[PDB]
Design an enzyme around this catalytic site. Structure first.
Site, PDB file in Angstrom:
ATOM      1  N   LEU A 138      -2.148   5.666  -0.292  1.00 38.87           N
ATOM      2  CA  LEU A 138      -1.640   6.564   0.847  1.00 38.87           C
ATOM      3  C   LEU A 138      -1.576   6.030   2.050  1.00 38.87           C
ATOM      4  O   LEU A 138      -2.606   5.159   2.186  1.00 38.87           O
ATOM      5  CB  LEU A 138      -1.900   8.051   0.413  1.00 38.87           C
ATOM      6  CG  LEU A 138      -3.382   8.372   1.040  1.00 38.87           C
ATOM      7  CD1 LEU A 138      -3.342   8.367   2.560  1.00 38.87           C
ATOM      8  CD2 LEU A 138      -3.582   9.496   0.172  1.00 38.87           C
ATOM      9  N   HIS A 139      -0.577   6.048   2.625  1.00 39.80           N
ATOM     10  CA  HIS A 139      -0.578   5.421   4.070  1.00 39.80           C
ATOM     11  C   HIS A 139       0.613   6.194   4.759  1.00 39.80           C
ATOM     12  O   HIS A 139       1.758   6.346   4.511  1.00 39.80           O
ATOM     13  CB  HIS A 139      -0.025   3.973   3.980  1.00 39.80           C
ATOM     14  CG  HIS A 139      -0.086   3.020   5.158  1.00 39.80           C
ATOM     15  ND1 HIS A 139      -1.403   2.179   5.094  1.00 39.80           N
ATOM     16  CD2 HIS A 139       0.466   2.709   6.199  1.00 39.80           C
ATOM     17  CE1 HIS A 139      -1.312   1.436   6.312  1.00 39.80           C
ATOM     18  NE2 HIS A 139      -0.149   1.836   6.796  1.00 39.80           N
TER      19      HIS A 139
ATOM     20  N   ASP B  37      -6.488   7.539   3.901  1.00 36.39           N
ATOM     21  CA  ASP B  37      -6.335   7.319   5.308  1.00 36.39           C
ATOM     22  C   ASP B  37      -6.743   8.482   6.141  1.00 36.39           C
ATOM     23  O   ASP B  37      -6.673   9.610   5.818  1.00 36.39           O
ATOM     24  CB  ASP B  37      -4.910   6.805   5.611  1.00 36.39           C
ATOM     25  CG  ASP B  37      -4.821   5.131   5.848  1.00 36.39           C
ATOM     26  OD1 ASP B  37      -5.869   4.706   6.006  1.00 36.39           O
ATOM     27  OD2 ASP B  37      -3.752   4.636   5.602  1.00 36.39           O
TER      28      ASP B  37
ATOM     29  N   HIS C 295       0.488   6.383 -10.408  1.00 34.13           N
ATOM     30  CA  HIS C 295       0.571   5.752 -11.536  1.00 34.13           C
ATOM     31  C   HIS C 295       1.064   6.301 -12.866  1.00 34.13           C
ATOM     32  O   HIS C 295       1.348   5.868 -14.045  1.00 34.13           O
ATOM     33  CB  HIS C 295      -0.729   5.238 -12.176  1.00 34.13           C
ATOM     34  CG  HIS C 295      -1.105   3.987 -10.696  1.00 34.13           C
ATOM     35  ND1 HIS C 295      -2.412   3.506 -10.594  1.00 34.13           N
ATOM     36  CD2 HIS C 295      -0.522   3.307  -9.736  1.00 34.13           C
ATOM     37  CE1 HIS C 295      -2.577   2.655  -9.427  1.00 34.13           C
ATOM     38  NE2 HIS C 295      -1.444   2.543  -9.224  1.00 34.13           N
TER      39      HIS C 295
END
Length: 310
Positions: free
Chosen positions: A273-274, A232, A287
């Protein structure tokens, strides 16, 4: 020179989320992730969950399945003109999910009549077009397959007029996808991670489902198993890229190239991701522990389509 590396504090947000990915914030500031890897009786049964950022509790908003075939929801974006989630599903293609749990599958075939491929990540441009990576083979009922070794991953654009158009193919595990916008809001470049090849690809966006000038945009460090996953932009159009298997998030300048900075993670396999809207806070799935973390970046994230106004 060496690539500078920073080590911000990561705070655990929630855990026990199998294959945690697809972090997203809806128009009310609610936080959602997806658990693609949840299985029942050895068969897919992925979930879309809401997380209370105070407690860390989980609430299953949707356990999608079509004609009995369970979904593997893998990536999310919130719509602008309605509080609904567009969800890339590795078994079902593209879904639109409501907060009440109702969902609909958008396409079993694409604009040329080919069977849809299962999808992983997606990104709205400011025109409202949804760019989507499809690293899986054909959607259910076809047997689940992924382009880890063979180059059959595809790219789609779900246009505002409702067309599911395959815009490129022959990728080896296309993963994260993001849109670089001009200062006035015009879409400029589409950035696409090709995970095992350690490459980031870019196209020039000429319009809905119209991409040209395909070329390598960035190089992902390392020879570990893995590579670029979710990505992002921050508000300066620096691109932050989860480098799964490296224990790092890479930071690219707007023009790509080599990372200008690395972010050391306290875990090996960052997956997606954000940014949290209107903050410097990045939420990161990984993970290694099937958990969600957050850390503070140097500036606010780039506004998602769902934050923009007509």
């Amino acid at each position: 020179m060496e690539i500078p590396v920073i080590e911000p504090l990561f705070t655990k947000v929630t855990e026990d989320i199998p294959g945690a990915m697809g972090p997203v914030f809806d128009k009310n500031g609610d936080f959602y992730i997806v658990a693609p890897s949840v299985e029942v009786n050895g068969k897919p049964a992925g979930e879309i969950l809401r997380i209370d950022l105070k407690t860390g509790k989980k609430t299953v908003i949707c356990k999608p399945e079509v004609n009995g075939y369970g979904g593997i929801p893998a990536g999310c974006q919130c719509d602008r003109d309605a509080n609904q989630l567009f969800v890339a599903d590795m078994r079902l293609g593209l879904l639109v999910v409501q907060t009440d749990g109702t969902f609909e599958e958008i396409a079993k075939k694409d604009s040329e009549g080919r069977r849809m491929q299962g999808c992983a990540y997606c990104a709205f441009d400011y025109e409202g077009n949804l760019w989507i990576t499809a690293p899986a083979g054909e959607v259910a009922p076809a047997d689940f397959t992924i382009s880890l070794q063979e180059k059959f991953g595809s790219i789609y654009c779900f246009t505002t007029d409702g067309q599911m158009i395959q815009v490129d193919t022959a990728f080896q595990f296309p993963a994260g996808i993001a849109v670089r916008h001009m200062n006035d809001g015009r879409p400029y470049q589409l950035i696409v991670a090709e995970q095992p090849t350690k490459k980031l690809w870019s196209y020039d966006i000429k319009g809905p489902a119209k991409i040209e000038n395909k070329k390598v945009w960035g190089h992902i460090p390392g020879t570990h198993e893995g590579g670029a996953a979710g990505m992002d932009f921050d508000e300066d159009n620096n691109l932050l890229v989860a480098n799964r298997g490296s224990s790092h998030i890479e930071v690219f300048g707007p023009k790509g190239g080599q990372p200008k900075m690395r972010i050391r993670c306290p875990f090996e396999k960052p997956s997606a991701l954000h940014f949290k809207p209107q903050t410097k806070t990045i939420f990161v799935t990984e993970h290694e522990n099937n958990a969600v973390w957050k850390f503070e970046w140097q500036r606010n994230g780039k506004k998602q389509y769902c934050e923009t106004l007509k």
